Amino acid sequence: LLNIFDIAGSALAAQSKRLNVAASNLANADSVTGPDGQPYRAKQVVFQVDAAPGQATGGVKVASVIESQAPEKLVYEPGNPLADANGYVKMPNVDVVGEMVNTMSASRSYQANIEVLNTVKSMMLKTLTLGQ
Amino acid sequence: LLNIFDIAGSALAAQSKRLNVAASNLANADSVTGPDGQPYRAKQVVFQVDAAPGQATGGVKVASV
């Protein structure tokens, strides 16, 4: 895999994973329970630069998805199970505006990397006609 | 007609006939008489699936209002 295709493809993968996390947040906002019974903790991705040994630059890797540890806004329904003493359901802490902006920006970055890939592919296929 | 053009166009024509039945009924609500002199009997459309022979599925026919 040529280096520049690898860089832009890693960008594409990272953007797809970021958009997926944003969609999962925006979809499970207002979700009382998980499988076992616990709040849905809002999810974020971690972007880090790739190619750690060598040139210190190139590509983006989204290893280690993490959780946004904000204090998980509460509501009061003291007849609902999943409510502790001081009946307080846990109610995922997803901020819809932030997630919508994340989706928009991720789509735009995805487009930019796709279209870098197209430009580079044309560049290389033209290089193959060097001379002849 | 190509296959999906047929299916979706049949859906459109059936929906248009259903909408016309609805509009006619809605417009003739509180209408004492017909021409011959008879109550205006309200109308309905029945949706059958089209394509009885072959694959048994695809498109909608709404004959016999």
Next chain:
Amino acid sequence: ALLNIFDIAGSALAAQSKRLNVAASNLANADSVTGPDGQPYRAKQVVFQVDAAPGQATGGVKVASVIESQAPEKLVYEPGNPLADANGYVKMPNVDVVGEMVNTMSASRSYQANIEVLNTVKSMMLKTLTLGQ
């Protein structure tokens, strides 16, 4: 750019086309009270498998065995309309409209992808002909 990639992508095109035609049938026949013999219409789905099961390695998709979806067949209550049984319930086909919207959306996208793959392979092969000269 082998010739047995035309078969694979063409089969993918045919499978995507048949899935899309089925989803269009589902969306059109929503709220189709009766069948020709007289029966509620059963919303259908298509089953995708890998083509050429034995040996082979990997190659192509087959849409054999169109099946019938097992959604709970939602009811309505109009005991003035015939086709409603005791405890008058018109049987009302079970179409998940938004799911079918998305099915058509993705079917179109995958069909377009495979069409493109066909074109790209043909360009590969026509430039294969210019080997030497």
Next chain:
Amino acid sequence: DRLDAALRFQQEALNLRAQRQEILAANIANADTPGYQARDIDFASELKKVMVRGREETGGVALTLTSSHHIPAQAVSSPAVDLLYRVPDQPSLDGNTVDMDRERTQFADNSLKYQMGLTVLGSQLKGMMNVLQ
């Protein structure tokens, strides 16, 4: 000979590129089937294996060659390359581990490198023909 020992490497590499090409197009064609488990092969290791060993394609048998009019037919044949699983990201509830972006960037890369191989063979063969005239 010594004509097909110097051109052997690029010929084998270009055939292997075509084989990886229909592997990747099988990935693309089965984009939305459930439980597909996208496949791929390691090009460098497989190319070294081809040069050292040969072709040795595994699995394939044609009928016999008796007098004419005996309806030739062939079994399902597959190259000896060991298909490797592609490590998936983003689980998707239907087993399908075909990521459009990964498969598609690999498709474009493989296409470009196949074209590069065609260019290299064309150059070598034009050189041979330029010597001999």
Next chain:
Amino acid sequence: LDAALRFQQEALNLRAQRQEILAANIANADTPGYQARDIDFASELKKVMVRGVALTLTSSHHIPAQAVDLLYRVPDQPSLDGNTVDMDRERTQFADNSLKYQMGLTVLGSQLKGMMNVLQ
């Protein structure tokens, strides 16, 4: 002789490396604290035209093993996540660099084809 093609050749090669650098800037246009990097073409090209080490290289079966200045891009509009990739700047630079790569390809094509035309 026939190193008269050297300049453009190396120039073209340098442009390609630049693309990677610029491409990385676009890939990491969202990561926090990337500090967009770039190189200055003219000085880098002059230095390379003016100009890793060899290992134990007696007869075979001893496994030979092989061993630019990435300058900050001074930013504008600070963004609280350390990312200094002003994507607009990088888009303009990428377009121009792709164009000059095409120009170099055309120049090598012309020099090589002139050479080949003289030779037939």
Next chain:
Amino acid sequence: LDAALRFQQEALNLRAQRQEILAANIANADTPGYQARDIDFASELKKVMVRGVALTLTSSHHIPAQADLLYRVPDQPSLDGNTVDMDRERTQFADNSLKYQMGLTVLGSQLKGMMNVLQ
């Protein structure tokens, strides 16, 4: 020879004529008592394919020379007069344009094949 191109030639010409007919149907969507028309494509195409005399050829200055609208069954009567159903006309027009494009592509590909054989 070189009448292999005849079939798609006639098919494309017939598609264009049907396009004109359907555009006339759309244009007359609201005129009273228009009574929309159409043609049967399969029958017309068969008829054109299955089926022209050159005049007398005496001394020069001799002037050589030469030269089914079906009714669509309507649904939804109007008693505003007309019988053009917009949904049917629109689907037919879109299908006809698509098939015209197909015929154009096929004829162009045949011409490309013929021209590629010659060099």
Next chain:
Amino acid sequence: HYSPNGDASKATLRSRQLNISEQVPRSTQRNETSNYEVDRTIRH
């Protein structure tokens, strides 16, 4: 002169591609391609 191979008991097959298919409301299918070798006598 030839001999008639209308009977299957006394015919001679060089090849036979035979396919049988059906589902069970029944659809069935049966294709046959048979190539024969035929007795022949040539008087001059």
Next chain:
Amino acid sequence: HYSPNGDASKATLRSRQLNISEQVPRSTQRNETSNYEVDRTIRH
């Protein structure tokens, strides 16, 4: 003259490819391609 190898007890195979594949709704599949070697006598 030739010998009849209708019986596998006396048939003489050169190649035989065999694929058996079935699930258990029991979907079954079987393929058997055989190339035979045939006894022969040529009395001229």
Next chain:
Amino acid sequence: DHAIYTAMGAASQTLNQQAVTASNLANASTPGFRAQLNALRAVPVDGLSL
């Protein structure tokens, strides 16, 4: 690309909630009727990476 499915899920399932509310809400002035309260469950998709 599979993100759409998740989004679809939400949309589809939200309609189901609507349905419940509607049946929950038409049944005012139905004697002794017990409102059918509803919730949305997050369903993780535990898989081979990320």
Next chain:
Amino acid sequence: STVSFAGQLHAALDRISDRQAAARVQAEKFTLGEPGIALNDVMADMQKASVSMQMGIQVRNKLVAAYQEVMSMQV
């Protein structure tokens, strides 16, 4: 029995012609309105026929070049 490579060239030409004729009759049937035949199937078969025809043209070019070269050895 024998190969008679002129017979092999005849077989190749017959294959190319038959493939093109099959694609042409499929386009015939589809535009005629015959049910069954799909559009993507028509286009795919036309594509394959085009590739086979260019196969034949390239073989033609190289055979003509080869013959024009074997007629240049001095005897």
Next chain:
Amino acid sequence: IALNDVMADMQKASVSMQMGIQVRNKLVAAYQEVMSMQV
């Protein structure tokens, strides 16, 4: 058979036939140059 295999075979055979013909041309020319001298 693979298409790229067919064209690589095409070109290899073409080059081999060209080389054989050129070698024969050189040998025939040498023979005639030897046979056209004075004795």
